[PDB]
Design a protein around this ligand. Structure first.
Ligand SMILES: CS(=O)(=O)c1cccc2cccnc12
Ligand SMILES: CS(=O)(=O)c1cccc2cccnc12
Lengths: 245, 179
């Protein structure tokens, strides 16, 4: 992540991020809604950061330092460039909505009143079809990626040294290769939980309650489609094992 | 330190997310309780052994039978949760959660955990449950279920007051270390 965004999302909540004199101008219901919207953006910033660790630290580091056989790096990090493009774009839209809402003279005081429309756009049309295609492919390659990682770590000395080197810093404590893969697989199922809680505190404007209700339905439709499109790939699986599923 | 992996399973209202949040911060948040939990790697020393215990939540995966099992590979200990204010969450343990965990995590110890133990003596909880001819889960009902499902053990805790939370994760670490 870049320092400007890390600092803007350093606080544990929106109520601790904004100036106390600005917080005191809002009703409790607005504070509750803004705290959950802040958690959605903060966790999206961290999810994009997980994808940058996968693409820049691991994938590109293995290509530039190691002599892995062709197709091995793609097997460890399936769809990571596509996943990075989807979420970096979505994060960009969330951060621009926050930036437009800032009070003049402030880099921290804002209220986002219209998140629903942004979520409907993200979870409908071509962007939703791309999210569905990409997660159906990524989640079906999840087990294979973990097994390939374990095999390389146990048998390749230079691979083991590389992993131990780049994951040594304390800031990588939660972000080993297998941890990154599961953080990405679990991201999509966090959205309904966050959206439902934002919706609970968005009844003040009927058009906003309706828009978040539509967005929640679109997110659940995407999850149902991804879940129905998953079948774990396995290296060395024979055709007979597949057609006898 | 040796690395071990913990996954918590249970119904949507069982309190698993809150339990991981309170343990990982050693505090029930005073300003904002997070809606979700990403992951965490806790440094725990139990009975003289140092462990890095990676913690994972299955919240949000309950309705997705092909996504949910992706959380299970190489799990070393399972916390299987139910809420003491919900006898219904305890009823779904033996024939939904237990056969799933035994299939995807063979031979992995399961600790059955009764969450929200502070609600056992909450008058509002007792009144609401009495309308459906119910009462908060009794300790013997929790122990009997744990015994029946082949659990490594039975424990109770309250994320709200932190009582019993540290003991649950220290015991989970000991279970993860056993051969
Ligand atoms: C100027 S600072 O970097 O100390 C800062 C940053 C972010 C949020 C803040 C909220 C109140 C006060 N100060 C805040
Ligand atoms: C994840 S599930 O609820 O579909 C499930 C439950 C129990 C056992 C299973 C065995 C194979 C596949 N799935 C199983």
């Amino acid at each position: 992540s870049m320092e400007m965004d890390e600092k803007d999302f350093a606080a544990d909540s929106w109520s601790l991020a904004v100036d106390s004199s600005f917080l005191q101008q809002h009703k409790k219901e607005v504070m509750k809604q803004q705290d959950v919207i802040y958690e959605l953006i903060q966790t999206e910033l961290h999810h994009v950061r997980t994808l940058k660790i996968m693409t820049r630290l691991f994938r590109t580091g293995m290509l530039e330092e190691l002599h892995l056989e062709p197709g091995v790096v793609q097997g460890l990090f399936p769809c990571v460039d596509e996943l990075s493009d989807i979420h970096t774009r979505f994060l960009s839209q969330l951060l621009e909505r926050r930036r437009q809402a800032l009070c003049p003279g402030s880099t921290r005081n804002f209220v986002i009143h219209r998140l629903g429309d942004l979520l409907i756009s993200q979870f409908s049309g071509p962007s939703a079809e791309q999210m569905c295609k990409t997660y159906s492919e990524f989640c079906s390659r999840h087990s294979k990626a973990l097994k390939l990682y374990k095999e390389l770590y146990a048998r390749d000395k230079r691979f083991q040294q590389f992993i131990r080197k780049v994951t040594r810093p304390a800031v990588l404590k939660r972000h080993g290769v297998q941890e990154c893969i599961l953080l990405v697989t679990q991201r999509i199922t966090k959205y309904p939980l966050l959206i439902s809680r934002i919706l609970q505190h968005s009844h003040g404007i009927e058009e906003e309650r309706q828009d978040l209700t539509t967005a929640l339905g679109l997110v659940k439709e995407l999850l149902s489609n991804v879940d129905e499109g998953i079948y774990q790939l396995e290296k060395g699986a024979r055709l007979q094992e597949i057609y006898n599923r | 330190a040796i690395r071990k992996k913990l996954v918590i399973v249970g119904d949507g209202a069982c309190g698993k997310t809150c339990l991981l949040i309170v343990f990982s911060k050693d505090q029930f948040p005073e300003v904002y309780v997070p809606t979700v939990f990403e992951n965490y790697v806790a440094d725990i020393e139990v009975d003289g052994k140092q462990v890095e215990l990676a913690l994972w939540d299955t919240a949000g995966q309950e309705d997705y039978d092909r996504l949910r099992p992706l959380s299970y590979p190489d799990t070393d200990v399972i916390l299987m949760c139910f809420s003491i204010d919900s006898p219904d969450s305890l009823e779904n343990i033996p024939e939904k959660w237990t056969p799933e965990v035994k299939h995807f995590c063979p031979n992995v110890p399961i600790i059955l955990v009764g969450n929200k133990k502070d609600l056992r003596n909450d008058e509002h909880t007792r009144r609401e449950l009495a309308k459906m001819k119910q009462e908060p889960v009794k300790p013997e009902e929790g122990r009997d279920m744990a015994n029946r499902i082949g659990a490594f053990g039975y424990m109770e805790c309250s994320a709200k007051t932190k009582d019993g939370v540290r003991e649950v994760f220290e015991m989970a670490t000991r279970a993860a270390l056993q051969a």
